[PDB]
């Protein structure tokens, strides 16, 4: 045996360090890797060691049943809404993510706050219930044996609320006081929840511990409308005034890493800085706190503030408009602010049926009604209806002219229109239905166009641009198979089937046949 | 630390095969990659180095030389070798021109092959030095005694004056089961044989063939038969028909001893290793005349000119080459019953015809062009080859199938065809031509990049028409591609051209398109 080192000459171009062992030739992964744009590592168990090659970075989700309106979405299950870098915060009015652009502000973007909703729902639904840790439960015989920490001219106290049966904390320190505090210490849990309700100015402050070292990070939780602030270890959120009651819930672990990789472009800086202790709040301002409690999780929610976004925010058209101006690529005219998207008023009726089975809210239903408007107009009449080759009616997540054809959001339209036609019943449904079943028409036929025989296309730019195909990152394949097997759940052609197997394959480097 | 291990690698999840570990560096075995990834790859021996040359892809884009025109070099034909394809049984006897194998002992004429055949013998005839030309016999003996020629006992070779010929000639008798006469030949550099010939009864013309198989040498009998080719032990026959008329025979022995040795009955000549050492001998039988007793290098106008003859003699009443035999195009596509056209057929026919009046000025090489146009105007389905995409794009079919496959390239060679002859027939007469092509173009454009795959491209759109898998082309059909789009360019100024071959070049070298 002799393994000596070849001379490996890459397509007469540039020249590579390999490996020989009589006339079999090995080739270092460091190339291929780039090359190829494949994925390995050493991995090394307990008693002996092992390459693991991977065409592909993503995988397949493992549906257990069929699909229907009240359960889980698609894969939502395993997303994670938050930590997308195009996530600027969560709005501490609103309490449903922000989308990130250039500039101090962030735009609300349907899209993203439904994709928050069903992810948090679908969660909901497949982990184990949170731990629930509540505090200031203990009753002090007399101020002195306060858990809390009251200074020199405040006031802390428990009084019982009639109005809502049960005792609370009535509040009152001044703005420039240390404020009236109460120690937490959970290093397990990170999700915050109080009720609360103002009556002047102030703050509700959180102190965290965190693997950066130093002085802890502290959260400001204060009534004021400001998005999102960051100066040294302080970071802030504004919550509104607060002064009718309401349940408060934080999400420390995004609020910290979001506060500090906040910046004015389109992504947040990643950081690997993460809480490790939730050490206390401090309270300013005059009112009254309640049910302090830290939780592992808490998916209603968040799956709600969505959903209320999304009723508060649909316009007289049934539409989410889009306030800032996109431009898809070279080719495509701008879409000024205002545009809808049919990934959005999909992905909005997804979430706002599952809020209607839970509640029977009527305003939910009422809501994904309304939002089948722009399905109806044309791209250029403030819709979002293409038509391919004069034959097929399309639902674009970019309304652009000349139209795109995205895959992903158009299917994401549908599963949104099955939601709200299965949900409306017969007679109200039967616009969602029609709807449906017209893009399933087009679905069917066009879908191999999006087929390259070894992945798939993000969209026919390709086609109605003359110009190259812009080929779906591999994540985004994972979406179209997700999607179809999806499908496949609902309708009986053999085509989404089909078309789940092959593209399956190419994950493992599968490919169609050539001649 | 670790510095040398036969390491596992889990592919996928799924295989395990063996790699090399050598410090933090992983190394692959070619042996799994070359089949996974479907690359290419040798070790060569330099003097000194050997080296490891790795390829993405194989074949080569053409290497263009000027603007495309009608009358010079077909694309990249001067490359091909038409005859060596394990799909052309045999030259024909009787026609000059290559027959296409299938099922059974037989073949059949097909057009697209005979007009690349043509086109390619055209081409190298514009590029290649010209052939060495050795005649024989040309020496006058005194008398019988001192003939170059062995005349057996019971036979004749004398050298008579044919007055309609007006030349000098070599009467022959000799009965079929006598050795017959006999000539010296001696060829060891040059395996094109020709000769005048005409017979007046019975017989056959046989060349003696030294190979480098060992054992006796192989015989090439070339009979007054219409039969195709047959093999028995080193005897190759090939039927030349009657020849009862003056004409000139020209054989490529090369060609003929492969096929020969190769015979079957089935789609696939078997490939030899054999070839041709020594051309030793010509041995006739029979009785009749011969004449100008040659052999060369090449002859690359003689097979032009069989092709070019055999179209205009093979056209039919509405202008097309009809195919005689069945094609199932696949899973999904009707049987293509005898009698079917091709557009690439119409069309390679047309620059091959083109070419030939271009050549000749003889009006019959025109006029078969002019017609060739007719199949154009019909769908596939009412015997034509027009095909419609979505209701909109007019498309010329290389298999008018039902439903429509639209293969990219056989299109592509159809528009150049009817540019060649548009281009030829002047304003008038090539207004018809001129019109089918630029209607082509235009689909063409817009339909380009439906067969853009982001990293090769897709031979035709069954996926799409059909609802199945991308039927992916070769690399040999990328190439194809690549040199007609290229050559396109050349007298089109579209950017689409231009853009697309600079895209799909870059796919050989492991380029792709972009993913989001
Ligand atoms: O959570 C998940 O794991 C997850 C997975 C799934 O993918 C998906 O879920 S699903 O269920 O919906 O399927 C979902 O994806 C989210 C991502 O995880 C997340 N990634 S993040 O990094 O964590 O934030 C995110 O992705 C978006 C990001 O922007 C970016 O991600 S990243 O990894 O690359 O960083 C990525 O951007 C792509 C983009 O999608 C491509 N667009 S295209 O239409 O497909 O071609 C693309 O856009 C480029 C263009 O190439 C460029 O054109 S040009 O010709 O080169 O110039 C153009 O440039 C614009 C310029 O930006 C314009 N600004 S504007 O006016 O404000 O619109 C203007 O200046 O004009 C230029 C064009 O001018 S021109 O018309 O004259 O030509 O746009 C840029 C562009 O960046 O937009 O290529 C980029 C990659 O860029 S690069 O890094 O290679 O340079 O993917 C984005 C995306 O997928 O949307 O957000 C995903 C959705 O999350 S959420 O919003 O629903 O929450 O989650
Ligand atoms: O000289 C050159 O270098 C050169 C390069 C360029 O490529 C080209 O030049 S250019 O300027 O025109 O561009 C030109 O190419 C020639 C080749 O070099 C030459 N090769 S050769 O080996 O030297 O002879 C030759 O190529 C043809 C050969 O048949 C073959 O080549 S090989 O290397 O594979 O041996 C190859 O066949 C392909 C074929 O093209 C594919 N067809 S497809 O439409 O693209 O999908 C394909 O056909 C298969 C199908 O997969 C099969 O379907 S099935 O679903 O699997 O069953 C189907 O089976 C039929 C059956 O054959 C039928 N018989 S029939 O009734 O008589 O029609 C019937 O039984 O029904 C079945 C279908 O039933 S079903 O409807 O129910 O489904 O057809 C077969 C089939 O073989 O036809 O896949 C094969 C590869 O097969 S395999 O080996 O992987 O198994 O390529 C052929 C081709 O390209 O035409 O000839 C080329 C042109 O030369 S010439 O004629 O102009 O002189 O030169």
Not at 222 to 233: A, F, G
Not at 340 to 368: E, F, H, I, P
Not at 372 to 379: A, E, I, M, V
Request: glycine residues 8%; hydrophobic residues 35%; proline residues 4%.
């Amino acid at each position: 045996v002799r393994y000596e080192e070849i001379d490996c000459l890459i397509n007469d171009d540039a020249t590579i360090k390999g490996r020989r062992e009589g006339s079999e030739v090995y080739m270092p992964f460091s190339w291929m890797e780039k090359y190829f744009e494949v994925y390995g590592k050493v991995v090394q168990y307990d008693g002996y060691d092992r390459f693991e090659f991977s065409h592909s970075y993503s995988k397949v989700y493992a549906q257990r049943e069929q699909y229907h309106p009240n359960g889980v979405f698609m894969s939502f299950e395993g997303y994670n809404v938050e930590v997308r870098d195009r996530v600027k915060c969560i709005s501490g009015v609103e309490g449903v993510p922000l989308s990130t652009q250039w500039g101090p502000q962030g735009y609300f973007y349907a899209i993203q706050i439904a994709q928050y909703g069903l992810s948090h729902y679908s969660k909901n639904l497949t982990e184990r219930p949170p731990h629930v840790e509540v505090y200031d439960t203990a009753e002090e015989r007399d101020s002195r044996s306060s858990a809390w920490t009251v200074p020199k001219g405040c006031s802390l106290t428990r009084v019982y609320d009639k109005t809502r049966a049960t005792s609370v904390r009535e509040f009152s320190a001044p703005e420039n006081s240390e404020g009236v505090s109460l120690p937490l210490g959970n290093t397990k849990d990170f999700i915050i929840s109080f009720d609360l309700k103002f009556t002047s100015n102030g703050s509700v402050s959180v102190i965290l511990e965190t693997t950066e070292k130093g002085p802890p990070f502290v959260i400001h939780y204060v009534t004021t409308t400001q998005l999102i602030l960051l100066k040294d270890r302080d970071i802030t959120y504004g919550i509104g005034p607060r002064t009718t009651w309401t349940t408060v819930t934080r999400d420390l672990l995004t609020d910290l890493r979001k506060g500090i990789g906040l910046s004015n472009t389109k992504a947040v800086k990643a950081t690997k800085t993460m809480p490790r202790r939730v050490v206390k709040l401090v309270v300013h301002g005059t009112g009254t706190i309640d049910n302090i409690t830290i939780s592992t999780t808490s998916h209603m929610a968040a799956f709600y503030a969505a959903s209320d976004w999304l009723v508060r925010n649909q316009d007289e058209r049934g539409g989410w408009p889009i306030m800032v101006t996109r431009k898809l690529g070279e080719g495509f005219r701008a879409l000024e602010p205002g545009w809808y998207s049919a990934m959005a008023q999909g992905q909005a009726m997804s979430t706002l049926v599952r809020a209607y089975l839970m509640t029977k809210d009527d305003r939910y239903l009422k809501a994904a009604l309304r939002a089948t408007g722009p399905f109806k107009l044309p791209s250029e009449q403030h819709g979002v209806k293409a038509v391919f080759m004069n034959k097929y009616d399309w639902y674009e997540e970019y309304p652009t002219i000349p139209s795109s054809f995205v895959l992903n959001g158009f299917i994401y339209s549908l599963i949104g229109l099955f939601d709200l036609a299965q949900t409306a019943g017969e007679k109200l449904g039967r616009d969602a239905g029609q709807l449906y079943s017209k893009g399933m028409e087009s679905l069917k036929v066009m879908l191999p166009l999006y087929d390259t025989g070894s992945g798939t296309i993000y969209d026919l730019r390709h086609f109605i641009l003359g110009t190259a195909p812009n080929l779906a990152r591999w994540d985004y394949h994972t979406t179209h198979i997700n999607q179809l097997q999806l499908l496949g759940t609902i309708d009986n052609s053999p085509i989404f089937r089909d078309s789940v197997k092959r593209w399956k394959s190419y994950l493992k480097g599968g490919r169609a046949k050539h001649n």
